[PDB]
Design a protein around this ligand. Structure first.
Ligand SMILES: Cn1cc(-c2cnc3ccc(CCn4nc(-c5cccc([N+](=O)[O-])c5)ccc4=O)cc3c2)cn1
Length: 281
C-alpha cells in the first residue's frame, strides 16, 4: 500500500544541502534544501532525515501514522511538502525563516512587543483549534515545537512526519513503553496515567502561553522532575510573569485546572485570547 505516492518528490527535483544543518532530532538531522515546485519554481525548504530509525517495520509504522498530515491544511499548522525515497526517507517541509518559536523570543537582538507575544499565542490557539477539530491530539505542545516563518506566522509543528525530540533536555524516556515524556509541559493526569487528550493539550498550551510572556524562561526552574507531581497536586502553579496582563494569566490558570473536563476548549481559548488581543493591554 502506497498512498504516499501522492506526495512523493522526485530525487532530481530536490537538492539536500548536507553541508548546512539546521536541526538535530533523535530520528535524524534537518538540512537546508532546494525544491523544484510543480510549476518550476525554486523554493527554499527544510529536509528532515529519518535515517536514525533502521527497521522496515518501524519505518513504515512512522509513515502511515504521519502521512495524515498531508490532509491537514491550516495557516497555523505546519504543512508537508512531500517525502523523498532513495537519502533514507527524507521528509520535505517548508523553511521557517525564524526557526522555532522559543529560540526566536529568547534571542535578545529581537524586540517582540507584549502584543506580538500575545499574537503568537493566539496563532498557536488557532492552529490547535483546527487540530482538535480533526480529532488530532498533539501530546507535545511547547514553544520549542512551534515554528515562525517570514511573515511572522506561527506554525504548530512537531507532529506527524515532523514528530521528533529536538531538545533532549526536557524529555524523560519511559523505560517500559517507548514514550518520550516532556515532564514540565504535561497535564497532571498525564504524569499519572501517561494518557493524552485534547484537554491535556490545553494544559500544555497554558505552559506555552507562560513561555511566551517570559520570552522563553524554563518552567518550574526550582522544581525537580520527581517533585513536580506533588507540586501540582498541592494546587501550586506557574506564577504570573511580570509583563503578562491579568486576563491572560487567568486564561493560563484555566488551562491548569485539575479536572481535565473543566478546562476550556481550544475554541474557547481562541475567543478569550483574540478578545484580549484586540483590547487595550
Ligand atoms: C535556526 N533555524 C532553524 C530553522 C528552521 C527552519 N525550518 C525548519 C523546518 C523544519 C524543521 C524540523 C521540524 N521541526 N523542527 C523543530 C525544531 C525545534 C527546535 C529546534 C529546531 N532547530 O534545531 O531549528 C527545530 C520543531 C518542530 C518541527 O517540526 C526545522 C526547521 C528549522 C531556520 N533557522
Amino acid at each position: 500500500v502506497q498512498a504516499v505516492q501522492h506526495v512523493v518528490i522526485g530525487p532530481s527535483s530536490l537538492i539536500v544541502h548536507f553541508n548546512e544543518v539546521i536541526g538535530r532530532g533523535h530520528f535524524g538531522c534537518v538540512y537546508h534544501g532546494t525544491l523544484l515546485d510543480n510549476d518550476g519554481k525554486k523554493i527554499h525548504c527544510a529536509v528532515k532525515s529519518l535515517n536514525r530509525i533502521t527497521d522496515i517495520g518501524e519505518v513504515s509504522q512512522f509513515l502511515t501514522e504521519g502521512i495524515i498530515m498531508k490532509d491537514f491544511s491550516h495557516p497555523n499548522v505546519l504543512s508537508l511538502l512531500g517525502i523523498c525515497l532513495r537519502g533514507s526517507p527524507l521528509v520535505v517541509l517548508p523553511y521557517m525563516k525564524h526557526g522555532d518559536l522559543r529560540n526566536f523570543i529568547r534571542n535578545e537582538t529581537h524586540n517582540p512587543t507584549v502584543k506580538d507575544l500575545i499574537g503568537f499565542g493566539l496563532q498557536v490557539a488557532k492552529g490547535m483549534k483546527y487540530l482538535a477539530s480533526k480529532k488530532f491530539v498533539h501530546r507535545d505542545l511547547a514553544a520549542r515545537n512551534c515554528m515562525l516563518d517570514e511573515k511572522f506566522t506561527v506554525k504548530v509543528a512537531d507532529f506527524g512526519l515532523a514528530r521528533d525530540m529536538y531538545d533532549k533536555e526536557y524529555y524523560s524516556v519511559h523505560n517500559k513503553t517507548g514514550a518520550k515524556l516532556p515532564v514540565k509541559w504535561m497535564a497532571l493526569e498525564s504524569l499519572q496515567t501517561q494518557k493524552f487528550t485534547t484537554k491535556s493539550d490545553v494544559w500544555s498550551f497554558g505552559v506555552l502561553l507562560w513561555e511566551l510572556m517570559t520570552r522563553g524562561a524554563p518552567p518550574y526552574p526550582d522544581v525537580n522532575t520527581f517533585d513536580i507531581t506533588v507540586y501540582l497536586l498541592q494546587g501550586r502553579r506557574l506564577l504570573q510573569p511580570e509583563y503578562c496582563p491579568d486576563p491572560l494569566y487567568e486564561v493560563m490558570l484555566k488551562c491548569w485546572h485539575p479536572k481535565a473536563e473543566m478546562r476550556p476548549s481550544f475554541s474557547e481559548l481562541v475567543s478569550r485570547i483574540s478578545a484580549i488581543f484586540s483590547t487595550f493591554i
